[PDB]
Tab-separated table of C-alpha atoms and ligand atoms in Angstrom:
chain	number	residue	atom	x	y	z
F	1	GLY	CA	12.617	95.365	-145.562
F	2	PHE	CA	14.315	94.693	-148.905
F	3	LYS	CA	11.567	92.386	-150.242
F	4	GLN	CA	8.859	94.933	-149.373
F	5	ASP	CA	10.922	97.731	-150.978
F	6	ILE	CA	10.804	95.796	-154.263
F	7	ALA	CA	7.001	95.806	-154.032
F	8	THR	CA	6.965	99.535	-153.127
F	9	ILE	CA	9.122	100.464	-156.124
F	10	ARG	CA	7.089	98.186	-158.428
F	11	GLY	CA	3.862	99.844	-157.205
F	12	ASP	CA	4.985	103.197	-158.656
F	13	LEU	CA	7.765	102.025	-160.982
F	14	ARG	CA	7.864	104.816	-163.564
F	15	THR	CA	7.932	107.547	-160.883
F	16	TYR	CA	10.582	105.798	-158.767
F	17	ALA	CA	12.642	104.764	-161.802
F	18	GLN	CA	12.786	108.300	-163.193
F	19	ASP	CA	13.411	109.951	-159.811
F	20	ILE	CA	16.178	107.523	-158.818
F	21	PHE	CA	17.886	107.636	-162.219
F	22	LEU	CA	17.746	111.432	-162.080
F	23	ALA	CA	19.308	111.338	-158.600
F	24	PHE	CA	22.082	109.193	-160.157
F	25	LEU	CA	22.666	111.595	-163.099
F	26	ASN	CA	22.589	114.681	-160.876
F	27	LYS	CA	24.968	113.202	-158.276
F	28	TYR	CA	27.302	111.969	-161.045
F	29	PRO	CA	26.815	114.289	-164.064
F	30	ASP	CA	29.694	112.870	-166.084
F	31	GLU	CA	27.920	109.487	-166.127
F	32	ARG	CA	25.752	111.020	-168.868
F	33	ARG	CA	28.602	110.323	-171.348
F	34	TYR	CA	27.446	106.697	-171.484
F	35	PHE	CA	24.027	107.670	-172.763
F	36	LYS	CA	22.722	109.507	-175.822
F	37	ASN	CA	20.981	112.902	-175.786
F	38	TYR	CA	20.728	113.370	-171.980
F	39	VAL	CA	23.282	116.204	-171.700
F	40	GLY	CA	22.085	119.843	-171.654
F	41	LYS	CA	18.663	119.050	-170.215
F	42	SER	CA	16.912	119.696	-166.896
F	43	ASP	CA	14.991	116.969	-165.007
F	44	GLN	CA	11.657	118.137	-166.435
F	45	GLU	CA	13.094	118.113	-169.965
F	46	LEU	CA	14.352	114.530	-169.496
F	47	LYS	CA	10.989	113.423	-168.093
F	48	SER	CA	9.245	114.615	-171.275
F	49	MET	CA	11.646	112.665	-173.522
F	50	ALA	CA	9.843	109.442	-174.527
F	51	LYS	CA	13.112	107.472	-174.664
F	52	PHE	CA	14.061	108.564	-171.138
F	53	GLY	CA	10.871	107.196	-169.547
F	54	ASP	CA	11.091	104.003	-171.627
F	55	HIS	CA	14.769	103.396	-170.814
F	56	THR	CA	14.552	104.096	-167.112
F	57	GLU	CA	11.472	101.879	-166.686
F	58	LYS	CA	13.237	99.011	-168.477
F	59	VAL	CA	16.317	99.438	-166.265
F	60	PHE	CA	14.275	99.383	-163.067
F	61	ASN	CA	11.991	96.586	-164.300
F	62	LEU	CA	15.118	94.431	-164.625
F	63	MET	CA	16.732	95.752	-161.424
F	64	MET	CA	13.656	94.758	-159.447
F	65	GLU	CA	13.748	91.239	-160.966
F	66	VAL	CA	17.434	90.856	-160.027
F	67	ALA	CA	16.597	92.050	-156.510
F	68	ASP	CA	13.578	89.711	-156.328
F	69	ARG	CA	15.623	86.707	-157.490
F	70	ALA	CA	18.323	87.473	-154.887
F	71	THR	CA	18.695	85.638	-151.561
F	72	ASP	CA	19.687	87.877	-148.618
F	73	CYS	CA	20.632	90.633	-151.120
F	74	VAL	CA	22.941	88.254	-153.021
F	75	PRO	CA	22.007	88.246	-156.729
F	76	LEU	CA	22.048	85.217	-159.030
F	77	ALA	CA	25.282	84.677	-160.935
F	78	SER	CA	23.106	84.286	-164.063
F	79	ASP	CA	21.728	87.804	-163.487
F	80	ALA	CA	25.263	89.198	-163.147
F	81	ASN	CA	26.295	87.336	-166.323
F	82	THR	CA	23.416	88.920	-168.268
F	83	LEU	CA	24.300	92.419	-167.055
F	84	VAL	CA	27.967	91.967	-168.059
F	85	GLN	CA	27.219	90.373	-171.460
F	86	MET	CA	24.572	92.924	-172.590
F	87	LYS	CA	25.778	94.784	-175.705
F	88	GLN	CA	24.407	97.990	-174.197
F	89	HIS	CA	26.815	97.507	-171.259
F	90	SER	CA	30.035	96.969	-173.289
F	91	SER	CA	31.634	100.294	-172.198
F	92	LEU	CA	30.970	99.751	-168.479
F	93	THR	CA	33.075	98.835	-165.460
F	94	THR	CA	31.957	97.944	-161.920
F	95	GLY	CA	32.507	101.596	-160.905
F	96	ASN	CA	29.478	102.666	-162.949
F	97	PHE	CA	27.340	100.288	-160.894
F	98	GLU	CA	28.913	101.395	-157.602
F	99	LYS	CA	27.890	104.978	-158.362
F	100	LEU	CA	24.329	104.028	-159.322
F	101	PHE	CA	23.785	102.261	-156.013
F	102	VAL	CA	25.400	105.019	-153.945
F	103	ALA	CA	22.888	107.427	-155.560
F	104	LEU	CA	19.969	105.007	-155.048
F	105	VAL	CA	20.878	104.496	-151.367
F	106	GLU	CA	21.196	108.258	-150.763
F	107	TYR	CA	17.846	108.823	-152.494
F	108	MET	CA	16.220	106.271	-150.166
F	109	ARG	CA	17.858	107.834	-147.094
F	110	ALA	CA	16.743	111.335	-148.209
F	111	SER	CA	13.084	110.248	-148.631
F	112	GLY	CA	10.632	110.368	-145.686
F	113	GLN	CA	10.150	106.654	-146.393
F	114	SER	CA	10.872	103.442	-144.492
F	115	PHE	CA	13.081	101.955	-147.245
F	116	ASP	CA	15.680	99.482	-145.998
F	117	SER	CA	18.555	101.585	-147.371
F	118	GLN	CA	21.273	99.431	-145.735
F	119	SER	CA	19.956	96.370	-147.608
F	120	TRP	CA	20.104	98.257	-150.931
F	121	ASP	CA	23.675	99.253	-150.121
F	122	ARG	CA	24.496	95.595	-149.380
F	123	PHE	CA	22.727	94.496	-152.582
F	124	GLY	CA	24.692	97.092	-154.598
F	125	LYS	CA	28.012	95.899	-153.163
F	126	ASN	CA	27.068	92.244	-153.716
F	127	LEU	CA	26.032	92.999	-157.311
F	128	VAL	CA	29.399	94.684	-157.968
F	129	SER	CA	31.121	91.585	-156.508
F	130	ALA	CA	29.016	89.360	-158.775
F	131	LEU	CA	29.748	91.520	-161.839
F	132	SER	CA	33.476	91.145	-161.095
F	133	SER	CA	33.071	87.349	-160.786
F	134	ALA	CA	31.190	87.407	-164.115
F	135	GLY	CA	34.188	89.177	-165.661
F	136	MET	CA	33.387	92.882	-165.683
F	137	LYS	CA	36.501	94.986	-165.102
M	1	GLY	CA	-8.018	109.230	-125.143
M	2	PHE	CA	-5.827	106.246	-124.202
M	3	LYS	CA	-8.802	104.069	-123.169
M	4	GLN	CA	-10.591	104.747	-126.480
M	5	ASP	CA	-7.429	103.835	-128.401
M	6	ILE	CA	-7.410	100.472	-126.651
M	7	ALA	CA	-10.993	99.948	-127.900
M	8	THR	CA	-10.074	101.118	-131.416
M	9	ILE	CA	-7.124	98.726	-131.590
M	10	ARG	CA	-9.071	95.802	-130.061
M	11	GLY	CA	-11.957	96.353	-132.520
M	12	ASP	CA	-9.678	95.516	-135.452
M	13	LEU	CA	-6.821	93.808	-133.622
M	14	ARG	CA	-5.487	91.732	-136.548
M	15	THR	CA	-5.221	94.721	-138.881
M	16	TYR	CA	-3.648	97.156	-136.381
M	17	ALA	CA	-1.344	94.448	-135.012
M	18	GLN	CA	-0.011	93.590	-138.482
M	19	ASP	CA	0.209	97.207	-139.624
M	20	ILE	CA	2.070	98.481	-136.515
M	21	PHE	CA	4.380	95.455	-136.415
M	22	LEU	CA	5.325	96.009	-140.075
M	23	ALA	CA	5.784	99.716	-139.345
M	24	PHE	CA	8.220	98.666	-136.589
M	25	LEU	CA	10.190	96.305	-138.837
M	26	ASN	CA	10.354	98.770	-141.737
M	27	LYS	CA	11.604	101.647	-139.527
M	28	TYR	CA	14.075	99.401	-137.689
M	29	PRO	CA	14.941	96.689	-140.232
M	30	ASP	CA	17.683	95.208	-138.024
M	31	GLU	CA	14.907	94.098	-135.647
M	32	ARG	CA	13.723	91.498	-138.188
M	33	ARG	CA	16.694	89.367	-137.059
M	34	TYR	CA	14.665	88.325	-133.960
M	35	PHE	CA	11.996	86.891	-136.270
M	36	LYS	CA	14.020	84.531	-138.474
M	37	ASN	CA	10.905	83.176	-140.224
M	38	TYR	CA	10.010	86.662	-141.514
M	39	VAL	CA	13.348	87.317	-143.247
M	40	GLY	CA	13.140	87.809	-147.031
M	41	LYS	CA	9.354	88.039	-147.184
M	42	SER	CA	7.167	90.885	-148.438
M	43	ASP	CA	4.295	92.251	-146.323
M	44	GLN	CA	1.793	90.193	-148.379
M	45	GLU	CA	3.881	87.000	-148.107
M	46	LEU	CA	3.933	87.458	-144.322
M	47	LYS	CA	0.158	87.848	-144.072
M	48	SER	CA	-0.296	84.450	-145.769
M	49	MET	CA	1.833	82.728	-143.102
M	50	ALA	CA	-0.271	81.289	-140.268
M	51	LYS	CA	2.187	82.179	-137.485
M	52	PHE	CA	2.661	85.798	-138.646
M	53	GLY	CA	-1.027	86.625	-138.124
M	54	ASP	CA	-1.184	84.475	-134.962
M	55	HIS	CA	1.987	85.854	-133.329
M	56	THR	CA	1.350	89.488	-134.172
M	57	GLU	CA	-2.221	89.343	-132.833
M	58	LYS	CA	-1.028	87.657	-129.627
M	59	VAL	CA	1.654	90.321	-129.106
M	60	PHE	CA	-0.827	93.150	-129.502
M	61	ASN	CA	-3.485	91.382	-127.456
M	62	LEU	CA	-1.036	91.213	-124.543
M	63	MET	CA	0.014	94.840	-125.169
M	64	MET	CA	-3.628	95.889	-124.902
M	65	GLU	CA	-4.112	93.871	-121.691
M	66	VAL	CA	-1.123	95.670	-120.146
M	67	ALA	CA	-2.340	99.037	-121.411
M	68	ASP	CA	-5.837	98.417	-120.014
M	69	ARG	CA	-4.457	97.356	-116.595
M	70	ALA	CA	-2.322	100.509	-116.402
M	71	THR	CA	-3.307	103.584	-114.392
M	72	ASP	CA	-2.577	106.936	-116.081
M	73	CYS	CA	-0.307	105.122	-118.584
M	74	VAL	CA	1.721	103.482	-115.787
M	75	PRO	CA	1.826	99.680	-116.221
M	76	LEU	CA	1.655	97.160	-113.374
M	77	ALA	CA	4.995	95.931	-112.038
M	78	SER	CA	3.697	92.354	-112.455
M	79	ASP	CA	3.001	93.023	-116.149
M	80	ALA	CA	6.497	94.454	-116.605
M	81	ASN	CA	7.851	91.349	-114.842
M	82	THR	CA	5.907	89.036	-117.197
M	83	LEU	CA	7.441	90.762	-120.245
M	84	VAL	CA	10.968	90.457	-118.820
M	85	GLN	CA	10.638	86.827	-117.652
M	86	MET	CA	9.179	85.577	-120.971
M	87	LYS	CA	11.513	83.006	-122.592
M	88	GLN	CA	10.855	84.650	-125.982
M	89	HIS	CA	12.306	87.925	-124.636
M	90	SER	CA	15.537	86.590	-123.059
M	91	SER	CA	17.808	88.224	-125.660
M	92	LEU	CA	16.097	91.633	-125.439
M	93	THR	CA	17.085	94.984	-123.931
M	94	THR	CA	14.929	98.058	-123.174
M	95	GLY	CA	16.119	99.556	-126.483
M	96	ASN	CA	14.099	96.967	-128.422
M	97	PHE	CA	10.916	98.100	-126.676
M	98	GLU	CA	11.752	101.801	-127.125
M	99	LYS	CA	12.051	101.174	-130.894
M	100	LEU	CA	8.669	99.434	-130.967
M	101	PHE	CA	7.007	102.363	-129.202
M	102	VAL	CA	8.719	104.954	-131.411
M	103	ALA	CA	7.300	103.139	-134.461
M	104	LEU	CA	3.855	102.723	-132.841
M	105	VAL	CA	3.598	106.440	-131.989
M	106	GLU	CA	4.805	107.415	-135.492
M	107	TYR	CA	2.144	105.096	-136.942
M	108	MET	CA	-0.575	106.771	-134.860
M	109	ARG	CA	0.553	110.283	-135.843
M	110	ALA	CA	0.662	109.352	-139.538
M	111	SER	CA	-2.818	107.799	-139.452
M	112	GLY	CA	-5.765	110.077	-140.305
M	113	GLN	CA	-7.143	108.687	-136.580
M	114	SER	CA	-7.472	110.808	-133.443
M	115	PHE	CA	-5.209	108.499	-131.429
M	116	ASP	CA	-3.841	109.891	-128.166
M	117	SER	CA	-0.291	109.523	-129.507
M	118	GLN	CA	1.172	111.470	-126.569
M	119	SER	CA	-0.299	108.944	-124.112
M	120	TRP	CA	1.152	106.015	-126.096
M	121	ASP	CA	4.539	107.752	-126.045
M	122	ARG	CA	4.267	108.177	-122.256
M	123	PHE	CA	3.050	104.572	-121.814
M	124	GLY	CA	6.062	103.350	-123.805
M	125	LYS	CA	8.421	105.444	-121.655
M	126	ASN	CA	6.816	104.162	-118.446
M	127	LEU	CA	6.881	100.559	-119.664
M	128	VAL	CA	10.593	100.839	-120.492
M	129	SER	CA	11.198	102.274	-116.984
M	130	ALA	CA	9.147	99.448	-115.433
M	131	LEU	CA	11.034	96.940	-117.608
M	132	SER	CA	14.290	98.391	-116.263
M	133	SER	CA	12.884	98.346	-112.703
M	134	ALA	CA	12.067	94.653	-113.290
M	135	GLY	CA	15.606	93.710	-114.322
M	136	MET	CA	15.771	94.084	-118.102
M	137	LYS	CA	19.143	95.493	-119.234
J	201	LIG	C1	21.606	96.860	-162.004
J	201	LIG	C2	21.725	97.979	-162.716
J	201	LIG	C3	21.343	98.052	-164.214
J	201	LIG	C4	20.347	97.423	-164.860
J	201	LIG	C5	19.300	96.454	-164.266
J	201	LIG	C6	20.401	97.817	-166.249
J	201	LIG	C7	19.561	97.402	-167.255
J	201	LIG	C8	19.525	97.902	-168.537
J	201	LIG	C9	18.486	97.614	-169.498
J	201	LIG	C10	17.281	96.693	-169.203
J	201	LIG	C11	18.773	98.273	-170.633
J	201	LIG	C12	17.935	98.276	-171.934
J	201	LIG	C13	16.917	99.409	-171.844
J	201	LIG	C14	16.147	99.588	-173.131
J	201	LIG	O1	16.150	98.666	-173.991
J	201	LIG	O2	15.514	100.666	-173.291
J	201	LIG	C15	20.010	99.009	-170.422
J	201	LIG	C16	20.646	99.809	-171.346
J	201	LIG	C17	21.736	100.619	-171.117
J	201	LIG	N1	22.429	100.721	-169.910
J	201	LIG	FE1	21.980	99.662	-168.166
J	201	LIG	N2	21.463	98.682	-166.409
J	201	LIG	C18	22.062	98.860	-165.177
J	201	LIG	C19	23.161	99.656	-164.922
J	201	LIG	C20	23.766	100.524	-165.808
J	201	LIG	C21	24.765	101.521	-165.480
J	201	LIG	C22	25.331	101.739	-164.060
J	201	LIG	C23	25.091	102.179	-166.607
J	201	LIG	C24	26.113	103.333	-166.795
J	201	LIG	C25	26.241	104.321	-165.903
J	201	LIG	C26	24.296	101.618	-167.681
J	201	LIG	C27	24.347	101.999	-169.003
J	201	LIG	C28	23.473	101.639	-170.007
J	201	LIG	C29	23.517	102.164	-171.349
J	201	LIG	C30	24.530	103.188	-171.900
J	201	LIG	C31	22.364	101.486	-172.099
J	201	LIG	C32	21.957	101.707	-173.577
J	201	LIG	C33	21.544	103.164	-173.797
J	201	LIG	C34	20.129	103.435	-173.355
J	201	LIG	O3	19.295	102.489	-173.351
J	201	LIG	O4	19.824	104.611	-173.015
J	201	LIG	N3	23.503	100.614	-167.160
J	201	LIG	N4	20.447	98.755	-169.135
J	202	LIG	C1	4.874	95.553	-125.002
J	202	LIG	C2	5.521	94.990	-126.035
J	202	LIG	C3	5.553	93.458	-126.298
J	202	LIG	C4	4.611	92.547	-126.000
J	202	LIG	C5	3.260	92.819	-125.305
J	202	LIG	C6	5.068	91.242	-126.449
J	202	LIG	C7	4.401	90.035	-126.331
J	202	LIG	C8	4.746	88.822	-126.910
J	202	LIG	C9	3.935	87.615	-126.957
J	202	LIG	C10	2.512	87.466	-126.367
J	202	LIG	C11	4.629	86.663	-127.603
J	202	LIG	C12	4.194	85.207	-127.899
J	202	LIG	C13	3.275	85.079	-129.111
J	202	LIG	C14	2.714	83.675	-129.182
J	202	LIG	O1	2.364	83.085	-128.124
J	202	LIG	O2	2.604	83.135	-130.310
J	202	LIG	C15	5.906	87.233	-127.979
J	202	LIG	C16	6.913	86.582	-128.654
J	202	LIG	C17	8.081	87.142	-129.127
J	202	LIG	N1	8.517	88.446	-128.909
J	202	LIG	FE1	7.450	89.913	-127.923
J	202	LIG	N2	6.320	91.413	-127.014
J	202	LIG	C18	6.641	92.756	-126.952
J	202	LIG	C19	7.808	93.320	-127.419
J	202	LIG	C20	8.801	92.677	-128.129
J	202	LIG	C21	9.926	93.324	-128.770
J	202	LIG	C22	10.183	94.851	-128.728
J	202	LIG	C23	10.657	92.374	-129.368
J	202	LIG	C24	11.965	92.569	-130.172
J	202	LIG	C25	12.035	93.494	-131.127
J	202	LIG	C26	10.019	91.096	-129.122
J	202	LIG	C27	10.453	89.861	-129.547
J	202	LIG	C28	9.739	88.686	-129.542
J	202	LIG	C29	10.168	87.474	-130.197
J	202	LIG	C30	11.472	87.269	-131.002
J	202	LIG	C31	9.071	86.446	-129.919
J	202	LIG	C32	9.030	84.981	-130.412
J	202	LIG	C33	8.905	84.950	-131.934
J	202	LIG	C34	7.522	85.355	-132.376
J	202	LIG	O3	6.521	84.958	-131.723
J	202	LIG	O4	7.416	86.083	-133.395
J	202	LIG	N3	8.890	91.315	-128.363
J	202	LIG	N4	5.946	88.543	-127.539
J	203	LIG	XE1	21.307	103.163	-164.908
J	204	LIG	XE1	19.596	90.267	-165.534
J	205	LIG	XE1	7.177	93.244	-131.424
J	206	LIG	XE1	2.274	91.119	-119.479
């Protein structure tokens, strides 16, 4: 289930973080406009960029905490508040998050793995709802 | 063959019981709804709960009794009847059992072990038929 999936991802965090973020960027290439120096590079090129590995691990480190702190895939309002208020997230709207979780869910479905993809979809939708409540447009 | 697999499973009942049951829940996450006490818990959290180990071992003990009493993977009608009449199984349909046996067979195939996966598949099919013959919807 969802709780076990958190442990699975955490067990191989760098690999999962990079592969899922890449699935996001490749499904939604224009989402690269939010980041610096990701455009014009293949997956292997990105994976050899020190900043890429560091960033994506930090994103998924926090995502797993938000998931772990959730009850029945409903995140804490305090977690939503933090994600809205982060300076690094000032250009974002809930749509950016919708797309990330669509990509993450499709990645899980496309694996040969027993991820609880429906729970991640639910969690993504609930997070978007919480971001809206916390004041993200 | 099938008889050896019964011995293999019985030899380390706790471990196989937990591992196959988790395999079942992770392949068919909606099935966790029947086990309300297991909701929102990782595989390690579950193994620390007294009733998780107890229940799962008792389930697989009974499964092995039924398997051992079968002839050529055909279970006794009385054993089918017991499974149907059980209070704990009142809300179940044959589909629930099919899912369990799909996951069990997948588990056997994925293991490095020379399980007679084909016989377990057949036993599952015959049990479902006997469950139907005994009144289960
Ligand atoms: C629940 C999902 C998300 C989490 C947990 C999260 C978390 C984080 C974290 C921890 C950082 C700081 C990383 C560091 O210091 O290296 C960060 C930075 C950043 N995030 Fe997110 N984020 C999420 C979703 C998004 C989305 C959907 C976008 C846009 C598509 C986005 C855009 C950015 C940008 C532009 C930065 C700064 C640039 C960079 O570090 O490369 N974030 N985020
Ligand atoms: C041949 C297959 C099965 C066998 C041999 C079996 C056997 C058992 C046994 C012995 C118990 C009582 C455990 C105890 O006394 O503590 C039990 C309880 C229960 N069974 Fe089954 N069962 C089977 C299939 C299923 C399936 C497929 C489901 C639904 C997915 C299910 C749902 C339940 C539930 C909800 C309980 C009570 C809660 C619990 O003990 O966890 N059973 N079963
Ligand atoms: Xe992201
Ligand atoms: Xe957060
Ligand atoms: Xe079960
Ligand atoms: Xe039984």
